[PDB]
Design an enzyme around this catalytic site. Structure first.
Site, PDB file in Angstrom:
ATOM      1  N   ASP A   1      66.250  76.756 -48.409  1.00  0.00           N
ATOM      2  CA  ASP A   1      65.823  78.153 -48.250  1.00  0.00           C
ATOM      3  C   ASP A   1      67.021  78.959 -47.734  1.00  0.00           C
ATOM      4  OD1 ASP A   1      64.789  80.617 -47.292  1.00  0.00           O
ATOM      5  OD2 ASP A   1      63.024  79.620 -46.386  1.00  0.00           O
TER       6      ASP A   1
ATOM      7  N   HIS B   1      60.417  80.068 -47.597  1.00  0.00           N
ATOM      8  CA  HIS B   1      59.483  78.921 -47.731  1.00  0.00           C
ATOM      9  C   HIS B   1      58.272  79.104 -46.788  1.00  0.00           C
ATOM     10  CE1 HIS B   1      62.222  77.587 -50.701  1.00  0.00           C
ATOM     11  NE2 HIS B   1      62.408  76.312 -50.313  1.00  0.00           N
TER      12      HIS B   1
ATOM     13  N   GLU C   1      64.153  76.891 -34.379  1.00  0.00           N
ATOM     14  CA  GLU C   1      63.328  77.396 -35.429  1.00  0.00           C
ATOM     15  C   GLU C   1      61.866  77.012 -35.186  1.00  0.00           C
ATOM     16  OE1 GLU C   1      64.772  76.511 -39.495  1.00  0.00           O
ATOM     17  OE2 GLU C   1      62.683  76.708 -40.156  1.00  0.00           O
TER      18      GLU C   1
ATOM     19  N   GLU D   1      51.728  75.155 -35.836  1.00  0.00           N
ATOM     20  CA  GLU D   1      52.508  73.996 -35.288  1.00  0.00           C
ATOM     21  C   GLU D   1      52.659  74.083 -33.757  1.00  0.00           C
ATOM     22  OE1 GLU D   1      55.363  74.162 -39.188  1.00  0.00           O
ATOM     23  OE2 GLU D   1      56.183  72.812 -37.551  1.00  0.00           O
TER      24      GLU D   1
END
Ligand SMILES: N=C(N)NCCCN(CCCN)C[C@H]1O[C@@H](n2cnc3c(N)ncnc32)[C@H](O)[C@@H]1O
Ligand SMILES: N=C(N)NCCCN(CCCN)C[C@H]1O[C@@H](n2cnc3c(N)ncnc32)[C@H](O)[C@@H]1O
Lengths: 342, 342
Positions: free
Chosen positions: A31, A280, A123, A132
Site C-alpha cells: 500500500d 488497504h 500504525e 483491533e
C-alpha cells in the site's frame, strides 16, 4: 497485564498468528499511500528523530524503525509480539543497523525498556480506525514517553456521513431472504429469516464507493493521542447532526479516518477518505436494516456508540432519526466480522 | 473430554464461532451437490430410517435431521456444539417436529444421549477429507451406536495424484520476490526472501483445475467408518506408487475425496473429484518446493504422511522420488492455513 485483562486468549492467539505471516506484511507494505506517507511524515520531520530515542509499537517487519533510522534516530526500540519479531531481527542485521534498532519481543504492556523515549511511532489504526483496539497499546506505551515527547501519529479523525446505495442494501437483503423459503428441500426455514437479516446487517461493509452517494457533509470526531488515556477508548460516544443536502433513502452511515503526524517542521496527513487515493483500509459502511427517508434540509441526528469487547474489537450501536418526521433506526454491528466486498 | 484433550481452546473458540453464523450454514446448504446428495442418500434408503433412532453429529441448522424425519425416523438426536443449536431448535418448533427431533447442545464427546441409536448421520468431511478433525467426533459417536448400526456416510476415499502446473508453481516465486529488493523505500528486504518462499509453499492450494494437469491415475486411501477408531486418524500414512501417463515436471500432488452412503436399498456416492461438478470443498493441491522431472512410464513413489495437530488440522509431509532417476523432493505443509486461490 493490561493487554491480557482486556483480551480473550482465543482472540490474542488468532491476532498474533495473523500478523506472523510475511504475506500479510507484504500486503501492507505494498500500500504505497500507507508506506510512502509514513516515510514522508518521518523524513520531512527529521529534527523530531535526529539523535533521539524512539519506540516503535508493533513494528512488524520493522519498516517504520528503518524510517526512523534513515531520519537519524540514535536508538529505536522496536516492540513486536508476533513471531514477525524474528524476521525484523534478520532485516536489522542485513541492513547493518544492529547499533541503532533493537528488537524487543513481546507485548508493549509486558516488556521493560531500558530508557524513556523522545517519540513513539506506530500504525495502530484498524478499519474504522478503532478495530483491533491497538490504539490502547499505543496509548499505554505513553508510560515510556518523556515529558513533552511526541507521537506519530499524533491525532486521529473519524469521519461519518449518511449514504444512499440501493444496490448495496439489496445485495445484503437478498442474501438474508434465502431464509424466507417455506420449502427448502421440503423444510421450512422462514422462522430464522429475522435472525438471518440481523446477522447480515450486523456486518460492516468494507469497500470503496463514489463520493456522490454521500448525502451530507461528514461529521468529525477527533482523538488526540498525546492526551487520551487507554480507558477513554473502552466506550466511544459519537453524537452527530447531519444537515441533509439531497433527498433520498439513507441506507446507513459511511466511515473513514485521517491521522495527522504533527511534527516540528510540518504536519503530514494520511487520509483514507473516499476523495483520496485508495488505501488497504478502504472505507466502511454500516447499513440500516430499514432505511430512513429524508428530504434535503432535514436533520438526521443520533449517536454512534462503540463499546470495546474482549475480541479486540467493538460492538457498534447506531441510532439515528430524521428530526422532522421522528423516523428512527437502531442498529448493532459487530466490527470483528466485516464483509469484504471488494 | 476426548475433544478438549486433542484441541487448543483457541482453535475450538474460532471453530465454533465460524459455524455459529447462518451465512456459513447457508453457504453449505446452497451447495446443491452436497445437500441434494445427502437428501437422495437418506430418502432412497428409507428402510434405514423408517421408525429408527438416529444420531446427527454436528447438525448445524438441522437439515440432515429433517431429511431423516422425511424418511420416517421415529427419533433423531441432533447434537451441535456451536450457538447454531439454538437456531436448529427454532426450526424444529416451526416445522412441528419437537416430538421427533431433539436438539442437544454441546460436543458429542461431552453430552449424554438417553438411548443407543440405529444409525449415525453427519457431514464430518473437511478439505482433503480430514481437515477440521471432525471425523474423530463422528467415530467417537460410535459409542452410541447399536451393534450392527449403520453410518451415513459409511466410507471415505481420499484420492491423490501428481500434477503439473507451471503457472501455479511460478506464482509462488513471483509473490515471494517482493522481498528480493535491495531498496524498498531505502530498506534491503532480500534477507527475508527465502522465508517468504517457505511460507507460501507451506500452504495447500484450495481451488479447482482442469483434469488435464493430472499426470497419473489417482491412488486411493480408504477409511471405513464402521470399523475405524479415533486413534487411526492421528497419523495417516499414504504410500503411493504412480505410473506416469504423461511426461513433464511434477509440481506436486492433488487431493480430492469421495464418500459413500451404503444403504440397504442402494449405495449413493458424493464425489468431490475434478471430473465431477464442483462443490464448496473444491480440490486441494500441495506443491513441492522442487519439482521432479518424470517421463511417461516412470514411477513416482513416496509417502504422504498426515500428522494431526491441536489446531484441528494436520501437518502434511510429502516425500517423493522418481525411481528411474533418484530425484527426490520433500515438503511440509500446514493444512490449517490453506491458500484460497478461487
Ligand atoms: N488494519 C491494518 N491494515 N493495519 C493495522 C496495523 C497493523 N500493525 C502492523 C504494524 C506494522 N508497521 C499490527 C502490528 O502491531 C503489532 N502489535 C499489535 N498489538 C501489539 C502489542 N500489544 N504489542 C506489540 N505489538 C503489537 C502486530 O503483531 C502487528 O505486527
Ligand atoms: N464445508 C466444510 N469444509 N465442512 C463442512 C462442516 C460440516 N458441519 C455442518 C453440519 C451440517 N450437516 C459442521 C458442523 O459440526 C459441528 N461440529 C463439529 N464438531 C462437533 C463436535 N465435536 N460436536 C458437536 N458438533 C460439532 C460444527 O459446529 C458445525 O455446525
Amino acid at each position: 497485564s493490561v493487554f491480557s485483562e482486556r483480551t480473550e486468549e482465543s482472540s490474542a492467539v488468532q491476532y498474533f498468528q495473523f500478523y506472523g505471516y510475511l504475506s500479510q506484511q507484504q500486503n501492507m507494505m505494498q500500500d504505497y499511500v500507507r508506506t510512502g506517507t509514513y516515510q514522508r511524515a518521518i523524513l520531512q520531520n527529521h529534527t523530531d528523530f535526529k539523535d533521539k530515542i524512539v519506540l516503535d509499537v508493533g513494528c512488524g517487519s520493522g519498516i517504520l524503525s528503518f524510517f526512523a533510522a534513515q531520519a537519524g534516530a540514535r536508538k529505536i526500540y522496536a516492540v513486536e509480539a508476533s513471531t514477525m519479531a524474528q524476521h525484523a531481527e534478520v532485516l536489522v542485521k542485513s541492513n547493518n543497523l544492529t547499533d541503532r534498532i533493537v528488537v524487543i519481543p513481546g507485548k508493549v504492556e509486558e516488556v521493560s525498556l531500558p530508557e524513556q523515549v523522545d517519540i513513539i511511532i506506530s500504525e495502530p489504526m484498524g478499519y474504522m480506525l478503532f478495530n483491533e483496539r491497538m490504539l490502547e497499546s499505543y496509548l499505554h506505551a505513553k508510560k515510556y514517553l518523556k515529558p513533552s515527547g511526541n507521537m506519530f501519529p499524533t491525532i486521529g479523525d473519524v469521519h461519518l456521513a449518511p449514504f444512499t446505495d440501493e444496490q448495496l442494501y439489496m445485495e445484503q437483503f437478498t442474501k438474508a431472504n434465502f431464509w424466507y423459503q417455506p420449502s427448502f428441500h421440503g423444510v421450512d426455514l422462514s422462522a430464522l429469516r429475522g435472525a438471518a437479516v440481523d446477522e447480515y446487517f450486523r456486518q460492516p461493509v468494507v469497500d470503496t464507493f463514489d463520493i456522490r452517494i454521500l448525502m451530507a457533509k461528514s461529521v468529525k470526531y477527533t482523538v488526540n493521542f498525546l492526551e487520551a488515556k487507554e480507558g477513554d477508548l473502552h466506550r466511544i460516544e459519537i453524537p452527530f447532526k447531519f444537515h441533509m443536502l439531497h433527498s433520498g433513502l439513507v441506507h446507513g452511515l459511511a466511515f473513514w479516518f485521517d491521522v495527522a503526524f504533527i511534527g516540528s517542521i510540518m504536519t503530514v496527513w494520511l487520509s483514507t477518505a473516499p476523495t483520496e487515493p485508495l488505501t488497504h483500509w478502504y472505507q466502511v459502511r454500516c447499513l440500516f436494516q430499514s432505511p430512513l427517508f429524508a428530504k434535503a434540509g432535514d436533520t438526521l441526528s443520533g449517536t454512534c456508540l462503540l463499546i470495546a469487547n474482549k475480541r479486540q474489537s467493538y460492538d457498534i450501536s447506531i441510532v439515528a432519526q430524521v428530526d422532522q418526521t421522528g423516523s428512527k433506526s437502531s442498529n448493532l454491528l459487530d466490527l470483528k466480522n466485516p464483509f469484504f466486498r471488494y
